[PDB]
Design an enzyme around this catalytic site. Structure first.
Site, PDB file in Angstrom:
ATOM      1  N   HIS A   1      46.900 -17.814  59.428  1.00  0.00           N
ATOM      2  CA  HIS A   1      45.464 -18.217  58.814  1.00  0.00           C
ATOM      3  C   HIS A   1      44.452 -17.028  59.260  1.00  0.00           C
ATOM      4  O   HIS A   1      43.242 -17.128  58.926  1.00  0.00           O
ATOM      5  CB  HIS A   1      44.981 -19.556  59.095  1.00  0.00           C
TER       6      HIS A   1
ATOM      7  N   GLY B   1      38.395 -19.405  68.177  1.00  0.00           N
ATOM      8  CA  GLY B   1      38.775 -17.961  68.624  1.00  0.00           C
ATOM      9  C   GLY B   1      40.139 -18.206  69.497  1.00  0.00           C
ATOM     10  O   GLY B   1      40.331 -17.160  69.853  1.00  0.00           O
TER      11      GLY B   1
ATOM     12  N   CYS C   1      42.994 -19.785  68.588  1.00  0.00           N
ATOM     13  CA  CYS C   1      44.053 -19.803  67.586  1.00  0.00           C
ATOM     14  C   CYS C   1      44.922 -18.589  68.153  1.00  0.00           C
ATOM     15  O   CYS C   1      44.325 -17.541  68.497  1.00  0.00           O
ATOM     16  CB  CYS C   1      43.632 -19.534  66.325  1.00  0.00           C
TER      17      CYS C   1
END
Ligand SMILES: Clc1cccc(CN2CCOCC2)c1
Ligand SMILES: Clc1cccc(CN2CCOCC2)c1
Lengths: 304, 304
Positions: A41, A143, A145
């Site tokens: 993503h 942030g 991820c």
């Protein structure tokens, strides 16, 4: 003596964390050998995130669109592929700090450490369990991820988790390092409800053993029970069923303490039926379920 | 979202841990520049430990009696001195993995991470507070002496604790890195009772702010109180007094949440007077006091 929610030392994983930027989206990647792993993503605009087609979005991306920074030095991307819900960025440099490592897919109830990271920089380390509903109860801001979960066996890092999603209920979902989600979650901003968060019974029993070993014994009672009888009580209190496999795994703690597993089950049963009556066990007012039998043995024996 | 007992990433400290052996006693040392720091009781036979005279015992020791191993390579000791309750072993090699560092003496209520170590090898990392009675509630087995407590500010490790003692009550005592004990403890196997373990009020308030920020708000009430009135309640429940300094330090959390500090004090007062009535706050059934206001800001803002 003393018992603590203890994480693995994070050094080996700190040296694998990089920053990955695609367009305006920055998150964390894991640099192992000449590959950087990150959530797919990264290629999304939060607009995309409502119903993204990752194959079609990735058509518009080139090696040079993936900006990979290890500290303050840029890595040259020489290839990219999608495996399930992760991207693998081939770089021209092997991570010199690559530890011995494996990718493992854990089962619910199993525990691991999370190195929470922002812009490829570690912020902290804590110990988690994969909930029976395949969520984890993490601490993750925007942030974070691409932050990873891991276990260490002597010198070998087993990576079991990469962070992808926060559910609207503030619990966390992610993938193994092959990009397959734990549980039914998809990397889409949609209605995704977690199932029942049941208690990991075998972990509570392990932690009751840990309590006895460390001097906390008030909850030991005069009673025993059977697996079937215990499991009726477990079901009433949204505890996972206890298997003979769980009893076998608790054997060493049974052996050390001389308290039969079914006796400890009967102590847990009374705790479920009667509560703590304002008392504490290893400084907790609830039954802790994020220590495995292996975690209690490790911490109680001093394994490095 | 989510709130976790989070430790600093331990990598910077892992690279400073060595094994120190004197005669038959092995424990952990901290290798910074060309000095290894370790507890002075490394020179004791547990026989000595009843009433040791460290000056007289050290007369019988030479540089070559201190065996210092960094991984599987031996360090050459070229000098030794005693500073309070620590030994400083001058070695002929600067630790190439020495991070930027300071030695700090913390105050009670302040939090830090412990890298639990055995034979110079890290076993795990967890987050602690210096209790108001200058003990810590650690997880430490035999061989863990010389394990250190630290904070990290960006790239700079502040070492605040070295592990020395377990009290007969299974709580832990240690020194700053100048070898001065926190509290009245001595490095002697004697009768040493800890004082009252009071609750760190300012940390509980910080953690109630953290709860509100993360969605847990059931405990917010319609009431306010005064510092003096709150402090009467605190004293009844063995909570530390709240100072104006504590109120000032909570300002940012006050500002963010729009809940005045004295309003949150009145919520805490009701929680003390009424208990949790079987409810939980950030997955705890008791009032957590091992997050500082700084820890809540850090974790809630994502500082690396
Ligand atoms: Cl983490 C993980 C989870 C499940 C399976 C595997 C092994 N792989 C080997 C390569 O091809 C596919 C399967 C790893
Ligand atoms: Cl950890 C620490 C605690 C108290 C004081 C100091 C500073 N030192 C500098 C050198 O000489 C003595 C004092 C450090």
């Amino acid at each position: 003596s003393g018992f603590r929610k203890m994480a693995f030392p994070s050094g080996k994983v700190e040296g694998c964390m990089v920053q990955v930027t695609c367009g305006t989206t920055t998150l964390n990647g894991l640099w192992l050998d000449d590959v950087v792993y990150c959530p797919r993503h990264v290629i999304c605009t939060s607009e995309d995130m409502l119903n993204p087609n990752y194959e079609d979005l990735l058509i518009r991306k080139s090696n040079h669109n993936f900006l990979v920074q290890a500290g303050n030095v840029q890595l040259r991307v020489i290839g990219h592929s999608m495996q399930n819900c992760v991207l693998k960025l081939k770089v021209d440099t092997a991570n010199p700090k690559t530890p011995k490592y494996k990718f493992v897919r854990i089962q619910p109830g199993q525990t691991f450490s999370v190195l929470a990271c922002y812009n490829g920089s570690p912020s902290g380390v804590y110990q988690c369990a994969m909930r029976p509903n395949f969520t984890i109860k993490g601490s993750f801001l925007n942030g974070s991820c691409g932050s990873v979960g891991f276990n260490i066996d002597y010198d070998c890092v087993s990576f079991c988790y990469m962070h992808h999603m926060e559910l609207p209920t503030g619990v966390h979902a992610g993938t193994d390092l092959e990009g397959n989600f734990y549980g039914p979650f998809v990397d889409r901003q949609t209605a995704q409800a977690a199932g029942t968060d049941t208690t990991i019974t075998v972990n509570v029993l392990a932690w009751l053993y840990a309590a006895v070993i460390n001097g906390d014994r008030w909850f030991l009672n005069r009673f025993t029970t059977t697996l079937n009888d215990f499991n009726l009580v477990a079901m009433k209190y949204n505890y996972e069923p206890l298997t003979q496999d769980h009893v076998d795994i608790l054997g060493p703690l049974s052996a050390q303490t001389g308290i039969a597993v079914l006796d400890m089950c009967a102590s847990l049963k009374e705790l479920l039926q009667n509560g703590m009556n304002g008392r504490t066990i290893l400084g907790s007012a609830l039954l802790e379920d994020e220590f495995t039998p292996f975690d209690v043995v490790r911490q109680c024996s001093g394994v490095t």
